Amino acid sequence: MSPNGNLIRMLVLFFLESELHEHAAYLVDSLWESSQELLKDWECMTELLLEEPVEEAMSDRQESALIELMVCTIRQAAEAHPPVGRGTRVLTAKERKTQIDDRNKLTEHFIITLPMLLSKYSADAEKVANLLQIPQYFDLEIYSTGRMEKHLDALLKQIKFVVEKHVESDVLEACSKTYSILCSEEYTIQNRVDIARSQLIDEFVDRFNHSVEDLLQEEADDDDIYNVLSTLKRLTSFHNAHDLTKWDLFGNCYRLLKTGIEHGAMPEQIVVQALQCSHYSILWQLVKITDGSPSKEDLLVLRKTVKSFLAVCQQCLSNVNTPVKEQAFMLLCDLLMIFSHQLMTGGREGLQPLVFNPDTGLQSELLSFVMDHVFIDQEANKIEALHKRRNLLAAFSKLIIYDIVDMHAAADIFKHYMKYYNDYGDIIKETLSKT
Template structure:
């Protein structure tokens, strides 16, 4: 009893000291002209609230932190948020923050857009804590403010917003997944509903050119971003009785997200504008992770990619994205895993692309991918080179046919129609694009190209304007 009485007297003495310090020093100095002193005040009052919460975790003290959230100096605002963070994180203390949260929640949410990035990151972290412990206080509009930050150019802010998305939207539901099966009875993977939600979020964001930013915001915190088997299943497997089929827009968005995640996983590099200006040097652990991810995605997509290309071959936007994927393969796996048959299927589909498309992006991607497949250091070189020769012959023949027909009409003083003009322009475009990646010297096309360049320059034969501009950039 004596010890207890002594302890209580000591506690009273500490309380009196701190109360005196608060009234005599804090209430005057928390508005000091020096921001360093204001920062110290906020950091210390936070410690008092955490360590001596019986007396100081009260709205009569919390209001000082709330008021100072509006301070004009970033470091002071940061110290306010850092003081609040452990209070919200404590199961014991969070219940005492309801009145403070309701009063200052709008200001904390607004600080997620703070011009000081450290403050914005800490504000997002604090909103996550509010979401965990006072979920009903945040309105849909509050959440949308944070959602948009996954597209921020600042990586730390975007990844913090990604954590918020994981807490608010992407919540696994094992019971819902257990009942999901494809039309042929295959059980869906656990990430299936989450990836569907991700696609819908991406569509509703209406920032389709920023798929790489969305992926970068989530790839380190949510394993669904590397669940390529789940993504390809959604694209290839027909939906079961309890599923809605993906519409065209959803398929396009899912393919874009998948390709962005493949690119980042296989290189370890954040998208342009999100990382350092120089190429980052990966640590040994990061390099191992990149190699493992690259091997994993290659093994899964070698047999799956031909199926995807076959399904979407006539869709320019989808096929342009899908054709990028082999650029991030570990190409040695074709040989070590005896996947030559799937390589032949891929090459056959690439050969079909120029025949079905005249879109510049599709043709450029096909030419670049074929160039990478045809590198001499790979064991698959001879197989790929034969396919390339066949493809280049087809492109040259199409050009010669279209060109001869067009020139013959001009020689006969006839006006080529729209179809004949389109055939010539598109065939010249294919030659120009593939010539930029592949040596077409042996194709005996130079005389014809040179003749048309002369026509374009001297105007002796009126060729379509686009033909002249394409020929003048063709690396003859």
């Protein structure tokens, strides 16, 4: 009770203090067979996290590590298998019984305590993002079963406060996914969550629209910039998993971008976010048009939107800020692949009016960016910046394979940059073998 308290407090200390386990997930997994009883004492953990001390308090770093370990135990209990990259998966009657009982315990416990955890740690971006990994493991039918409506209201309150207080992409994405899970995965609670979600979106679209209007009518203030960026960030996060097309966000993103090209003075993050949001609008417009039975004018309206946006992304390759170029480049390489002839697979030849062939100018600009921003002369930031350039090339590779860009001009560039491997590689290879 307080015994298990010491053992957990020390488990959190051994984790942080030794570099004998890099990953909380792997520490939890390794101890799982020997210490399941302890590692599922969630009452003990939430008590450590929520109580005020008598003596000796927990540090921010140990609080963070307990939350990260707690969430790892919640996963392992619910999935009843080792974590990704310790796998090898057929449960006994008693493992299956233990899994169901564990899912019941952690659901009842965290429906009650997760709102309290979010309240207390509301301002800490890393902690909140970790805590919001918990609902995915809930047996959500229990929100009805337990007359537990009061606690669903409480989580929704706390997600609203979190979304309202934060702009970090991890927090916002955690919030987006938590609404997604609450809605479409039990009818009983669907209607209540939909109401809270659309009210949250409503308040954010209003503040966004008023801020767009402020920024563009305006001399332009650092307040004007913050208001546009901050609200657009929230809406961009949600627009991936939530269909926000009912709110015409593409229209205002389009003005922000047109303004940024014309007068060349739109802050980089507003352009990047505006590009992402516009993209998510278009992808959702496309899904409604596939699944529907769309008319001629339906198709020709989505086309005008998509051609106007392809134009914007092209112009944005010329933006001074490389984060804009990369965003514009990534979207060009997605959209040119989606609105390719592929779109007329699975008996969907109705969509022909939506098909796009990039002109010469665009193909050449998509070649330039590869030469200038994938293949560059010159810690942790650099393994990350390299995986990105890999993804940019890989995205662009797909266009080459299906002849959407000039596949010869592309390989000419791959020649140029591989030369030293094709000129000296064998000699370098065998040299390095004998050392």
